[PDB]
mmCIF file with all atom_site columns, N, CA and C in Angstrom:
data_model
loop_
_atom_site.group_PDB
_atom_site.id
_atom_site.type_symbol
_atom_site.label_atom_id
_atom_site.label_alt_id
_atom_site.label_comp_id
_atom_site.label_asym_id
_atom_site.label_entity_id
_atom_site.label_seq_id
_atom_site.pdbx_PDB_ins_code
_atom_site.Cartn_x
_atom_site.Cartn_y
_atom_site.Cartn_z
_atom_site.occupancy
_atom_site.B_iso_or_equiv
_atom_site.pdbx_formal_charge
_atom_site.auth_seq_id
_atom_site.auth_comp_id
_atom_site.auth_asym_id
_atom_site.auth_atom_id
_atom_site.pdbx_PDB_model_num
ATOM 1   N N  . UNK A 1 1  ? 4.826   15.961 0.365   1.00 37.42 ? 1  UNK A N  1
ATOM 2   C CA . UNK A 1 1  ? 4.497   14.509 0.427   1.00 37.42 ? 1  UNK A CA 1
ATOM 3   C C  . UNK A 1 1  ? 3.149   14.262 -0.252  1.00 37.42 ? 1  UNK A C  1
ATOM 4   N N  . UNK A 1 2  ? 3.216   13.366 -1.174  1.00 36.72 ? 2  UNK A N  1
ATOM 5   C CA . UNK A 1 2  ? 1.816   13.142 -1.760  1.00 36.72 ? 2  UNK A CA 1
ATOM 6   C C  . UNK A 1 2  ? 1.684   11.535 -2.398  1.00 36.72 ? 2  UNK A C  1
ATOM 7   N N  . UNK A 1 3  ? 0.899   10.857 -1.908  1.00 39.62 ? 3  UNK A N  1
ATOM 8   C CA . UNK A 1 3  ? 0.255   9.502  -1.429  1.00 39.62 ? 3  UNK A CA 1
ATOM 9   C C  . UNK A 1 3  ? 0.034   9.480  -2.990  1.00 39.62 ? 3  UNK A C  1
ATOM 10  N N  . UNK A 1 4  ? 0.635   8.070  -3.685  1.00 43.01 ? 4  UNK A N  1
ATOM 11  C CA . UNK A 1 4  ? -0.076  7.907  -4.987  1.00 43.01 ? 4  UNK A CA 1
ATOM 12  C C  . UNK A 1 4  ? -0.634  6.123  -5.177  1.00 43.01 ? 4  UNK A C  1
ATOM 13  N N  . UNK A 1 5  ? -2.238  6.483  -4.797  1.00 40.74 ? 5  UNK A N  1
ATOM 14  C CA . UNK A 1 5  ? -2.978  5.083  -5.152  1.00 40.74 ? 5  UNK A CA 1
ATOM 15  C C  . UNK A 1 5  ? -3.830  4.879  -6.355  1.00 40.74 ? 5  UNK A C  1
ATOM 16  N N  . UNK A 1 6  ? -4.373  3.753  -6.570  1.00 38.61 ? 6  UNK A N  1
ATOM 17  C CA . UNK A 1 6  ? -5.062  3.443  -7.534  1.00 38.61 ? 6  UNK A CA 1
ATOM 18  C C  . UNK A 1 6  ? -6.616  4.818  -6.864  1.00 38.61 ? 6  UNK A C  1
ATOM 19  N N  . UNK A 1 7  ? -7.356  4.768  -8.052  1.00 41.09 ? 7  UNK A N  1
ATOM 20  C CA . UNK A 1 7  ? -7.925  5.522  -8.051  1.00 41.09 ? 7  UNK A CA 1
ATOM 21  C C  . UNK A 1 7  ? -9.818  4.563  -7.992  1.00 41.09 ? 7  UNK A C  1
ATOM 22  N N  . UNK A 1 8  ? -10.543 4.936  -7.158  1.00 44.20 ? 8  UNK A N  1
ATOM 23  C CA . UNK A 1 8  ? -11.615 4.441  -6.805  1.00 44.20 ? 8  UNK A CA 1
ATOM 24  C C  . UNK A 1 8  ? -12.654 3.468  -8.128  1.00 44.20 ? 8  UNK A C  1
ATOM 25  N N  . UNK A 1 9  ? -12.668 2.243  -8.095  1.00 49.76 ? 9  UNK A N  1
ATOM 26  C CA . UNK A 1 9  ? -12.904 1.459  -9.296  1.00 49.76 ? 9  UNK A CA 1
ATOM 27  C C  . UNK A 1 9  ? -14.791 1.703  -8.979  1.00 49.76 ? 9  UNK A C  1
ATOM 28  N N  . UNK A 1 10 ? -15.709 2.036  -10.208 1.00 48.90 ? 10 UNK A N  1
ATOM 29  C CA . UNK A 1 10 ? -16.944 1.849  -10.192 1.00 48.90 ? 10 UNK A CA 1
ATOM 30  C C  . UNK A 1 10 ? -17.251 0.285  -10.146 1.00 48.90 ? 10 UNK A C  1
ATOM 31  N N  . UNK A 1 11 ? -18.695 0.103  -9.582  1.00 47.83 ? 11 UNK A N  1
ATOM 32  C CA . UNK A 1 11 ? -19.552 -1.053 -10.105 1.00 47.83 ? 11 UNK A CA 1
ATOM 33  C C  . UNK A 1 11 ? -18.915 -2.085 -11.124 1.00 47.83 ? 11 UNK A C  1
ATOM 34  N N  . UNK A 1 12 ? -19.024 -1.741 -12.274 1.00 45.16 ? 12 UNK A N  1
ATOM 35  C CA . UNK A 1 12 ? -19.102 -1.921 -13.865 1.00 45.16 ? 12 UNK A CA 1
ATOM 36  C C  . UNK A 1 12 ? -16.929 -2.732 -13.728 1.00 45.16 ? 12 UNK A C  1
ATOM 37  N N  . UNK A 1 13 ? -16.530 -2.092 -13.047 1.00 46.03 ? 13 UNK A N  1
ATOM 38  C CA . UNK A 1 13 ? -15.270 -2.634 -12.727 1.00 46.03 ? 13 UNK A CA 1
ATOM 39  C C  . UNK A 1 13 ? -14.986 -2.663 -11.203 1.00 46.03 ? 13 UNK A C  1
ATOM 40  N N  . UNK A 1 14 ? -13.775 -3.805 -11.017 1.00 45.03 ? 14 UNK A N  1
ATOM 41  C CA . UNK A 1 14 ? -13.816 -4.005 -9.731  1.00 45.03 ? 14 UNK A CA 1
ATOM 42  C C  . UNK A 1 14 ? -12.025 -4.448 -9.436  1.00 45.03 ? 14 UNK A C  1
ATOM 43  N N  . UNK A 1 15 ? -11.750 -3.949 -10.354 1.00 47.10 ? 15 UNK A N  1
ATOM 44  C CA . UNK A 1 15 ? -9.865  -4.131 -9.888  1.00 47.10 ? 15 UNK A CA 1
ATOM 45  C C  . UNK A 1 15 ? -9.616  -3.013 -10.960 1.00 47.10 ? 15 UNK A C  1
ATOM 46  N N  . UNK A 1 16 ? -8.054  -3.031 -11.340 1.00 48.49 ? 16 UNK A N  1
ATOM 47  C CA . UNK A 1 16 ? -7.366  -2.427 -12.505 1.00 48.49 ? 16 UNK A CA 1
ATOM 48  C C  . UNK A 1 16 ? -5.700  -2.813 -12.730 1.00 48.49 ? 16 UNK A C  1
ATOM 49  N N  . UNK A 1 17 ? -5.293  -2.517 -13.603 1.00 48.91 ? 17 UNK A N  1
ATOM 50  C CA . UNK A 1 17 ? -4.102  -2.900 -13.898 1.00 48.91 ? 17 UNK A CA 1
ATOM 51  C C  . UNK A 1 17 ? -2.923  -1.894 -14.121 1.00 48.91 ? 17 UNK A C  1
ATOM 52  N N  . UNK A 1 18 ? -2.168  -1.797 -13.578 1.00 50.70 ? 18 UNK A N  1
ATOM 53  C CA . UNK A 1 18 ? -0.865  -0.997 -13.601 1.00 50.70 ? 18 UNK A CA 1
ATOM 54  C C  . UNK A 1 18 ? -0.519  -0.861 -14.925 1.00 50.70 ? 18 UNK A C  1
ATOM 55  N N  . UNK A 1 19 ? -0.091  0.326  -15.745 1.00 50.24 ? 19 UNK A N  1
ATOM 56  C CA . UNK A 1 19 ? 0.299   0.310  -16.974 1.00 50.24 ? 19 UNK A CA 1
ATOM 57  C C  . UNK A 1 19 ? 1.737   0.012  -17.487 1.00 50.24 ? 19 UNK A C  1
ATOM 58  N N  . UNK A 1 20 ? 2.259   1.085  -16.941 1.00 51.61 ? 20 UNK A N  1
ATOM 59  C CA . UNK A 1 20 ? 3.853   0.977  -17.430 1.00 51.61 ? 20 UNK A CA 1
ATOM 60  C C  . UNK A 1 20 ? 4.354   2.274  -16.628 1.00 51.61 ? 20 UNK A C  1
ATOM 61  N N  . UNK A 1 21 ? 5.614   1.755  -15.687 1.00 54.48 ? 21 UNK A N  1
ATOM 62  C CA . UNK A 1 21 ? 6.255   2.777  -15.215 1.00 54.48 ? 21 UNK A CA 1
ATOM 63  C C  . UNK A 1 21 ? 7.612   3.477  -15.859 1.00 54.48 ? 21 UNK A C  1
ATOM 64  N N  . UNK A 1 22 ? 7.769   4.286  -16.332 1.00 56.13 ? 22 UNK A N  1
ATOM 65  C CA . UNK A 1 22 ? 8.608   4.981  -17.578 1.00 56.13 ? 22 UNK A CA 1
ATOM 66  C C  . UNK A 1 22 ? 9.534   5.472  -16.589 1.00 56.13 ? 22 UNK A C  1
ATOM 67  N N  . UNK A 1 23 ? 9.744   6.057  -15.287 1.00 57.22 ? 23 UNK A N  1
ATOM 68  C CA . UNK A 1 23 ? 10.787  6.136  -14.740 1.00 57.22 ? 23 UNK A CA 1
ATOM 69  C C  . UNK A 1 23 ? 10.564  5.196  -13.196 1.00 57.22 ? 23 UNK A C  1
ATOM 70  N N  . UNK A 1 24 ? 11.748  5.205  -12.202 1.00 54.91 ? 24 UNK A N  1
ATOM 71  C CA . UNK A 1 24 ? 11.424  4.040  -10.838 1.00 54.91 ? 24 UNK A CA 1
ATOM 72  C C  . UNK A 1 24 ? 11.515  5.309  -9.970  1.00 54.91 ? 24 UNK A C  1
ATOM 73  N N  . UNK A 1 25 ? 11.342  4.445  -9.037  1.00 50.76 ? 25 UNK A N  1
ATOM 74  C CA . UNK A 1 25 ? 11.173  5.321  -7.566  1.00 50.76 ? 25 UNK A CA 1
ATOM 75  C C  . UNK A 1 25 ? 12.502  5.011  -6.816  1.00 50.76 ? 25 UNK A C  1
ATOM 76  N N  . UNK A 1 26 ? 13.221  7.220  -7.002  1.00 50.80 ? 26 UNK A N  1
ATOM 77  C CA . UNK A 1 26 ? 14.499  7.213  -6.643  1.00 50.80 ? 26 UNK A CA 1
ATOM 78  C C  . UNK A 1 26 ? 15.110  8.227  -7.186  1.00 50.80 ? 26 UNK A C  1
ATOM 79  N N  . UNK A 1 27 ? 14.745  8.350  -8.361  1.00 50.70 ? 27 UNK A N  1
ATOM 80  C CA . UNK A 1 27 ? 15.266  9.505  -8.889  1.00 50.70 ? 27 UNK A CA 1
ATOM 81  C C  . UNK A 1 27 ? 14.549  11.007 -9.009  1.00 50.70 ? 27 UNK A C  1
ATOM 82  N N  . UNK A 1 28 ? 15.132  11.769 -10.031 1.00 52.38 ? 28 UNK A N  1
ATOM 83  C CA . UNK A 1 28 ? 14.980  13.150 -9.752  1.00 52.38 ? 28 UNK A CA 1
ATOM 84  C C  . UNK A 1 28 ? 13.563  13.404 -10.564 1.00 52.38 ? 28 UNK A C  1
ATOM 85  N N  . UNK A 1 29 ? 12.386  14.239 -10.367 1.00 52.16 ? 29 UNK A N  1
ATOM 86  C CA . UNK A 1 29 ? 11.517  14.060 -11.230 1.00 52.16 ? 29 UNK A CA 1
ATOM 87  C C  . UNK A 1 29 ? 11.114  15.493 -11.543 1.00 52.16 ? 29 UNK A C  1
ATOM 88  N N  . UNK A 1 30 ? 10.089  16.170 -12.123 1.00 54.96 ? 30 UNK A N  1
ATOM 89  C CA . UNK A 1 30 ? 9.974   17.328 -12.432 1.00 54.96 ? 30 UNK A CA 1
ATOM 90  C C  . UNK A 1 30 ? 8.536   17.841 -12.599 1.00 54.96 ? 30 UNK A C  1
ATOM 91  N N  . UNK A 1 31 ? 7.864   18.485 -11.825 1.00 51.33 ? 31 UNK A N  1
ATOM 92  C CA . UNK A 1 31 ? 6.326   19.096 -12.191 1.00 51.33 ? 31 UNK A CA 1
ATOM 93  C C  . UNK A 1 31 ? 6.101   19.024 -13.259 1.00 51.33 ? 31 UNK A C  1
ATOM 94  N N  . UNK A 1 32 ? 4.436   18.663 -14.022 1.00 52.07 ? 32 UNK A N  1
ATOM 95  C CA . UNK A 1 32 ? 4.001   17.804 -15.269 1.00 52.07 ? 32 UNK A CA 1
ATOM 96  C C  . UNK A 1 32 ? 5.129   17.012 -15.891 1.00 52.07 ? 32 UNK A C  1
ATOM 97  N N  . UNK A 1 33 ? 5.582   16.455 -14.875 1.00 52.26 ? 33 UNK A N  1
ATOM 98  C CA . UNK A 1 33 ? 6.438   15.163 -15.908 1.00 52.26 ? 33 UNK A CA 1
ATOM 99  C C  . UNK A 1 33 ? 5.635   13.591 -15.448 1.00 52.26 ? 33 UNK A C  1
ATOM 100 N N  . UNK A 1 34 ? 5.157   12.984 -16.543 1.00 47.68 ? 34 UNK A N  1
ATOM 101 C CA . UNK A 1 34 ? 4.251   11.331 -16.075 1.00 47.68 ? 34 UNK A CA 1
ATOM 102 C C  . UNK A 1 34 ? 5.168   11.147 -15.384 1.00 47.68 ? 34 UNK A C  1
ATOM 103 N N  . UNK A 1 35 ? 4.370   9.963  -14.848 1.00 49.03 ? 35 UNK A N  1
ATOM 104 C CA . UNK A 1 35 ? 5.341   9.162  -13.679 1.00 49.03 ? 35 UNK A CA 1
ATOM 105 C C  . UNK A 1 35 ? 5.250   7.404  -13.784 1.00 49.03 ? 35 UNK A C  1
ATOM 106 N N  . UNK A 1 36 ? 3.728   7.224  -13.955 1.00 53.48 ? 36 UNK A N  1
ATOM 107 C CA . UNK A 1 36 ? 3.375   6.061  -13.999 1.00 53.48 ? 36 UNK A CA 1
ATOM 108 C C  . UNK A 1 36 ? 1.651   5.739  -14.732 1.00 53.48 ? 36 UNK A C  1
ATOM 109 N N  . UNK A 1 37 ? 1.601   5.167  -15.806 1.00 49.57 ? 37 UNK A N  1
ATOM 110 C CA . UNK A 1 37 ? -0.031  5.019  -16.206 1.00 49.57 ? 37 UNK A CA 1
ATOM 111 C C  . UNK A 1 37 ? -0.614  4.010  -15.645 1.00 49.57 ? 37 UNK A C  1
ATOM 112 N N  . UNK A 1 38 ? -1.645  4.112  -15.912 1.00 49.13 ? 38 UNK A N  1
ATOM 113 C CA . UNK A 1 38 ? -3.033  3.065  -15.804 1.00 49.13 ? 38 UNK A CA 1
ATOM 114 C C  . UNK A 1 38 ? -3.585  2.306  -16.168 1.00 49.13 ? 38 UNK A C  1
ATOM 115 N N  . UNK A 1 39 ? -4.103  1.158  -16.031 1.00 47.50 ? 39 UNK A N  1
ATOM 116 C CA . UNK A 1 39 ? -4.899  0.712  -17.318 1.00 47.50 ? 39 UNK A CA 1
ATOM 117 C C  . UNK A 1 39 ? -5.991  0.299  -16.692 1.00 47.50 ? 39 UNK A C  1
ATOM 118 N N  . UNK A 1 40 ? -7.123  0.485  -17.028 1.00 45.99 ? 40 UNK A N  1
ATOM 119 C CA . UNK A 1 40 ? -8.551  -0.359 -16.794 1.00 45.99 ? 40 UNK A CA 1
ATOM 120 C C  . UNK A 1 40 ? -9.369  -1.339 -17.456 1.00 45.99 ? 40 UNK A C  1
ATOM 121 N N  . UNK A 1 41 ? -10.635 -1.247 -17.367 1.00 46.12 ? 41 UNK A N  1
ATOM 122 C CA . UNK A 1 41 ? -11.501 -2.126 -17.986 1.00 46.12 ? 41 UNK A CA 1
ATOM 123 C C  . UNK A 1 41 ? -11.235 -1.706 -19.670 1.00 46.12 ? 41 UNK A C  1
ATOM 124 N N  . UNK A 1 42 ? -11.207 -0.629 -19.912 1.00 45.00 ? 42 UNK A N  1
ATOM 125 C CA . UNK A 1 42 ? -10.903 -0.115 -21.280 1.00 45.00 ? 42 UNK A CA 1
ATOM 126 C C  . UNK A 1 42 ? -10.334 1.243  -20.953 1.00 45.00 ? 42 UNK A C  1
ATOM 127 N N  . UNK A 1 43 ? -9.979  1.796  -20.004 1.00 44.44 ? 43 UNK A N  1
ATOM 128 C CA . UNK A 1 43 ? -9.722  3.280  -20.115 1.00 44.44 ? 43 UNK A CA 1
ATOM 129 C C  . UNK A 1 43 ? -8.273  3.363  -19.632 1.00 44.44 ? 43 UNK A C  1
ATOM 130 N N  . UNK A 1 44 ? -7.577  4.278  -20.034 1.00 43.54 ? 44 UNK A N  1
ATOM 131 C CA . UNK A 1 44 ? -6.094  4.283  -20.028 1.00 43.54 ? 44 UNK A CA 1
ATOM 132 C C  . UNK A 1 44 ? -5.979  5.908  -19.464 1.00 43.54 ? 44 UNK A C  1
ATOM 133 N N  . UNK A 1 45 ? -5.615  5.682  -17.968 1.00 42.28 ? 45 UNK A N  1
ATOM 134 C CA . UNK A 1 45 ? -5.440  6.799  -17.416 1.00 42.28 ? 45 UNK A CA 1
ATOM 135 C C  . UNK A 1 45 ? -3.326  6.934  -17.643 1.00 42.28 ? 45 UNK A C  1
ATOM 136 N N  . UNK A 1 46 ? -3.446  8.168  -17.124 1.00 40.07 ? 46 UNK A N  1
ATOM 137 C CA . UNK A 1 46 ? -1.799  8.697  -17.082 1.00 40.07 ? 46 UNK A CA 1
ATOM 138 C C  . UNK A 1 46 ? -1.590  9.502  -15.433 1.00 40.07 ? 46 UNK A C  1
ATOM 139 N N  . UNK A 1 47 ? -0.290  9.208  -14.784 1.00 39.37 ? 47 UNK A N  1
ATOM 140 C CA . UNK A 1 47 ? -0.564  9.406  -13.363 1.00 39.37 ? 47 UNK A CA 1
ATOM 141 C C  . UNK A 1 47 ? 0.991   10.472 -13.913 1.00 39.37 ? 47 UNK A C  1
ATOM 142 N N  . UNK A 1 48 ? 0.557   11.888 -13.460 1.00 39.51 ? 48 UNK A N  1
ATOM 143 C CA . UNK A 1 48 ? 1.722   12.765 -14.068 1.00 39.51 ? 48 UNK A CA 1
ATOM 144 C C  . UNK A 1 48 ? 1.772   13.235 -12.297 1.00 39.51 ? 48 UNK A C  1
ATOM 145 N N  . UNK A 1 49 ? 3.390   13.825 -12.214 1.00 43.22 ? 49 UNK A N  1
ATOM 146 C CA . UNK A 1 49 ? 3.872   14.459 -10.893 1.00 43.22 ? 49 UNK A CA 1
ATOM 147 C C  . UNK A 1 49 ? 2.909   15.988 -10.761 1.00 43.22 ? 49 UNK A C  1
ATOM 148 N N  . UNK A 1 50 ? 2.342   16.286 -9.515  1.00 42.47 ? 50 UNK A N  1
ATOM 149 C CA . UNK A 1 50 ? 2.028   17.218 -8.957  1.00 42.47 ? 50 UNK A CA 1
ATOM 150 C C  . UNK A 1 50 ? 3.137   18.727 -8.507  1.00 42.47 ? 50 UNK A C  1
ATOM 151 N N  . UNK A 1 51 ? 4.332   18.078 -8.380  1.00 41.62 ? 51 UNK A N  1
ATOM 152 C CA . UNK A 1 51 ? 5.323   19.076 -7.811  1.00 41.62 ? 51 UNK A CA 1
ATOM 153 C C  . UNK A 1 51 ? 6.956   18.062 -7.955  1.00 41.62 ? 51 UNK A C  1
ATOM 154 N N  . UNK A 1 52 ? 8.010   18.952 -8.480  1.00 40.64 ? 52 UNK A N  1
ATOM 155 C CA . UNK A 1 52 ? 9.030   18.515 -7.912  1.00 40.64 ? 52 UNK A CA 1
ATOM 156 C C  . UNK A 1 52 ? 9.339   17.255 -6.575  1.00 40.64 ? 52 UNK A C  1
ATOM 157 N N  . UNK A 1 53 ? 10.312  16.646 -7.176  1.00 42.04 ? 53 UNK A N  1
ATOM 158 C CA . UNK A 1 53 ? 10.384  16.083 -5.499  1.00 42.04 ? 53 UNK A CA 1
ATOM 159 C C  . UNK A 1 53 ? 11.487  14.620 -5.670  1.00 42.04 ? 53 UNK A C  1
ATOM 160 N N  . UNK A 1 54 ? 11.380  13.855 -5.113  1.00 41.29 ? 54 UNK A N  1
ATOM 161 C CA . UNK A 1 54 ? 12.117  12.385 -5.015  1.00 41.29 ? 54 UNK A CA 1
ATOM 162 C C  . UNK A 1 54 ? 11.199  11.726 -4.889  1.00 41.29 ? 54 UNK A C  1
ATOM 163 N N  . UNK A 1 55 ? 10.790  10.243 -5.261  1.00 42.93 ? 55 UNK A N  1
ATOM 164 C CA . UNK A 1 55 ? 9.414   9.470  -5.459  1.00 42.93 ? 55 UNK A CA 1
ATOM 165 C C  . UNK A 1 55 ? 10.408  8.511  -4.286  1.00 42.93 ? 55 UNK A C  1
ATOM 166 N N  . UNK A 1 56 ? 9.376   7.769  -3.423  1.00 43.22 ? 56 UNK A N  1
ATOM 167 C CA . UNK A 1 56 ? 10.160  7.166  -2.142  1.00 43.22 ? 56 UNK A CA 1
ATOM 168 C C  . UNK A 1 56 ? 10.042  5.121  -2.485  1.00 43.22 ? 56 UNK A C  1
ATOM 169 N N  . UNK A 1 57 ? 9.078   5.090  -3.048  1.00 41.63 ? 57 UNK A N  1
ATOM 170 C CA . UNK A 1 57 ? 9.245   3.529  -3.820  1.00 41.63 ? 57 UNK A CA 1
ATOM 171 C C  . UNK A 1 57 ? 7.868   3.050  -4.437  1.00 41.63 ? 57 UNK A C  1
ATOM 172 N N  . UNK A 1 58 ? 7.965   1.699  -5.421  1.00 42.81 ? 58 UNK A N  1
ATOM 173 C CA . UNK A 1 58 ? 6.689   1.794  -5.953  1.00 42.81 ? 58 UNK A CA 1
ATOM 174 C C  . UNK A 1 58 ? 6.541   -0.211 -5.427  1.00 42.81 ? 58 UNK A C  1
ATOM 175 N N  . UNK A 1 59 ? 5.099   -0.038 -5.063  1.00 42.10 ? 59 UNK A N  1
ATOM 176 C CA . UNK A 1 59 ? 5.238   -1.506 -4.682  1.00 42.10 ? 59 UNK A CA 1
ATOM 177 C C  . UNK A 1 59 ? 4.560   -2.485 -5.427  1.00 42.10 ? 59 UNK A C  1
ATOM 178 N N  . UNK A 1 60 ? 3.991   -1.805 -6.739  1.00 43.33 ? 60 UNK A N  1
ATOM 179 C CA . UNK A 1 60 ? 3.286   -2.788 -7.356  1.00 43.33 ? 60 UNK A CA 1
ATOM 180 C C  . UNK A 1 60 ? 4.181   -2.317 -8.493  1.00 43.33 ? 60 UNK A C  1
ATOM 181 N N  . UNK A 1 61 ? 3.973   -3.381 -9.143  1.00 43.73 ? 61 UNK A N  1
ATOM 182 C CA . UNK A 1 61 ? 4.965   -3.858 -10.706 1.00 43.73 ? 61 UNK A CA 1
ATOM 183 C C  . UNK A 1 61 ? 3.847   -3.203 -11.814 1.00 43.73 ? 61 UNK A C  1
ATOM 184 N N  . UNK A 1 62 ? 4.863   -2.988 -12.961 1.00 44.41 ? 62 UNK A N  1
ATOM 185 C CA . UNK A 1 62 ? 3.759   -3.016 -14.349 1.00 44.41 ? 62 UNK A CA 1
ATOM 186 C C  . UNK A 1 62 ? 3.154   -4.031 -14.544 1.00 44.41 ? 62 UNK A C  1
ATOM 187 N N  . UNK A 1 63 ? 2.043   -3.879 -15.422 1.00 45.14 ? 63 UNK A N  1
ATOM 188 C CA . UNK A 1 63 ? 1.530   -5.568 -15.978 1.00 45.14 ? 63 UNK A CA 1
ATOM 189 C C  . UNK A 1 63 ? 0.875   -6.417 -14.356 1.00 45.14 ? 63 UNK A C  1
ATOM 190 N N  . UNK A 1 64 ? 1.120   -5.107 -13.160 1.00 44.76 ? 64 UNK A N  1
ATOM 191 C CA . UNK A 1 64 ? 0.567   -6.140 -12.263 1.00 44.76 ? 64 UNK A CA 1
ATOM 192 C C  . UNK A 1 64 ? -1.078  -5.675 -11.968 1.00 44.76 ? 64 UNK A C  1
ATOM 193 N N  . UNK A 1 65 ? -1.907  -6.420 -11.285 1.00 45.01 ? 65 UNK A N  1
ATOM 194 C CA . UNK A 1 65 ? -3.090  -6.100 -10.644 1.00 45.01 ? 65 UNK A CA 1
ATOM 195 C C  . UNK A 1 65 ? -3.371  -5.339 -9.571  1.00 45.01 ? 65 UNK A C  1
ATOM 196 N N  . UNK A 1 66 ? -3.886  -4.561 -9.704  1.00 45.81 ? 66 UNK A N  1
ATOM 197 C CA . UNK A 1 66 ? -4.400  -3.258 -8.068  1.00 45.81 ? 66 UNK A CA 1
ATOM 198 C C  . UNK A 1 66 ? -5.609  -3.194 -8.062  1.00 45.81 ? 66 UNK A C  1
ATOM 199 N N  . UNK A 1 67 ? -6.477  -2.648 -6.951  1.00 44.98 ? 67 UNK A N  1
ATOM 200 C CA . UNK A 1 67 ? -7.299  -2.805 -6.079  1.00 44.98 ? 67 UNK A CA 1
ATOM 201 C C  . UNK A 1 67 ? -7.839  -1.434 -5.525  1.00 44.98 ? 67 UNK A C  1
ATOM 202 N N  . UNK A 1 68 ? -8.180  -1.249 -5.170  1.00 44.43 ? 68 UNK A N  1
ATOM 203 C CA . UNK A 1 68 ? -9.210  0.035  -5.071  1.00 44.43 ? 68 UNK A CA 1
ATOM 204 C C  . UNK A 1 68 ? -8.708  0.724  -4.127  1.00 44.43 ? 68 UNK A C  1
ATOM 205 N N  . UNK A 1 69 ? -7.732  1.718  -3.904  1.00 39.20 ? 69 UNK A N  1
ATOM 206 C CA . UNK A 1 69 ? -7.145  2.485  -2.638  1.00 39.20 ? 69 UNK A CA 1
ATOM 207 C C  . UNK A 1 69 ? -5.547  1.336  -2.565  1.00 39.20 ? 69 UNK A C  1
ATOM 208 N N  . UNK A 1 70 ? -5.016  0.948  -3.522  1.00 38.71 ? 70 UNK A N  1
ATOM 209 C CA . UNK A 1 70 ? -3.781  -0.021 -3.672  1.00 38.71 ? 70 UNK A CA 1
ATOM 210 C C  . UNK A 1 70 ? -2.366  1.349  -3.616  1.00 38.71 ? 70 UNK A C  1
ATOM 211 N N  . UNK A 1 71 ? -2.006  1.054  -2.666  1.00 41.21 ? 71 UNK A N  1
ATOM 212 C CA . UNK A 1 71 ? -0.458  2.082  -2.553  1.00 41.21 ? 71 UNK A CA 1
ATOM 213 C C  . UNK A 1 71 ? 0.141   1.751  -3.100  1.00 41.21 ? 71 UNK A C  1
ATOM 214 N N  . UNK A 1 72 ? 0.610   2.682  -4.515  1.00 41.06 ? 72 UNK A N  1
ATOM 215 C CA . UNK A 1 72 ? 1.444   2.034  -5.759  1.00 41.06 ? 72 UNK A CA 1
ATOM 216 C C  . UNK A 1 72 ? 2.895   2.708  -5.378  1.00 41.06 ? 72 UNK A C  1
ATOM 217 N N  . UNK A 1 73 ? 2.370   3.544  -4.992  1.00 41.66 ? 73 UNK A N  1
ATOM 218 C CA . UNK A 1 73 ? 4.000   4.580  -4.793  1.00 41.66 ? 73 UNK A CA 1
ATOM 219 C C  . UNK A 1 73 ? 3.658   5.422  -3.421  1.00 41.66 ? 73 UNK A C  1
ATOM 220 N N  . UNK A 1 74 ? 4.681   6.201  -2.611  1.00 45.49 ? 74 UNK A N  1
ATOM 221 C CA . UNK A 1 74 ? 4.411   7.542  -2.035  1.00 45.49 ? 74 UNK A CA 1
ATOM 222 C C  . UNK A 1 74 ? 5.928   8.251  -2.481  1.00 45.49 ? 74 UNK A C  1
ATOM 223 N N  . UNK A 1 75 ? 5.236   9.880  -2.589  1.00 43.11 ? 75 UNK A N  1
ATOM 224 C CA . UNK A 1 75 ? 6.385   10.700 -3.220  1.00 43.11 ? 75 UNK A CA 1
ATOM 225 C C  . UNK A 1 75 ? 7.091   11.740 -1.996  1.00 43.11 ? 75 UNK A C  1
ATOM 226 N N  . UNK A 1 76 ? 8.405   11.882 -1.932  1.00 42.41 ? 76 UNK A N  1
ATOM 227 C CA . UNK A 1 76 ? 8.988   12.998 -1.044  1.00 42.41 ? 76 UNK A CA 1
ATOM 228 C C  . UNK A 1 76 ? 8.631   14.302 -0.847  1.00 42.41 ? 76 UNK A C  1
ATOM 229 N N  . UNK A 1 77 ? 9.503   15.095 -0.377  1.00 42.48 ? 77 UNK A N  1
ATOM 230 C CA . UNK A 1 77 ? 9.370   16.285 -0.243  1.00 42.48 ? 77 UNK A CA 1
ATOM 231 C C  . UNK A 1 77 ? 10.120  16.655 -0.893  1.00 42.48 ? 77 UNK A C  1
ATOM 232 N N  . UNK A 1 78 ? 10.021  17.968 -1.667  1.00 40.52 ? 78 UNK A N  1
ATOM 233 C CA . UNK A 1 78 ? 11.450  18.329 -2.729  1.00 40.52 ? 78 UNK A CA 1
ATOM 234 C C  . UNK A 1 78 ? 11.578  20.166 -1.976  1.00 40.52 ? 78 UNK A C  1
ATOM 235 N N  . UNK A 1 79 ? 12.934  20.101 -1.871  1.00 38.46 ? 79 UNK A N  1
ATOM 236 C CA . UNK A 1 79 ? 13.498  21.213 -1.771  1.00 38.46 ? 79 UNK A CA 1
ATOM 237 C C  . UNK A 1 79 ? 14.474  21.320 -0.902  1.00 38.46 ? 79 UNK A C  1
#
C-alpha cells in the first residue's frame, strides 16, 4: 500500500497542478512504469510506480488544481 499525494509546495509557490494521467486507477501496472505527472510553478515532475500492484482510485482530474498533502490517488497491494 502506498499513499500518492502532491508533494510539499515551497514559499515561492503555494498550490500545483496535476499533469496528465497516461493510465486510470484500476488497472494492472508495473514497477518503474509512470503513473501520473506534475506540473508546477515551472517544474514538471513525473510520479512513476514504486512496486507492482492495482492503483485503488484517483480523485483529482488532469488540468486540475492540488494543494499541499492533496490525495491524488492511493495504490493496492500486489501479489
Amino acid at each position: 500500500a502506498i499513499d500518492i499525494k502532491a508533494p510539499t509546495f515551497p514559499e515561492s509557490i503555494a498550490d500545483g497542478t496535476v499533469a496528465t494521467w497516461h493510465k486510470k486507477p484500476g488497472e494492472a501496472v508495473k514497477r518503474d512504469e509512470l503513473i501520473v505527472d506534475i506540473e508546477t510553478d515551472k517544474v514538471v515532475m513525473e510520479v512513476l510506480a514504486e512496486a507492482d500492484g492495482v492503483i485503488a482510485e484517483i480523485v483529482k482530474n488532469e488540468g486540475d488544481t492540488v494543494l499541499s498533502g492533496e490525495l491524488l490517488g492511493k495504490l493496492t497491494e500486489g501479489g
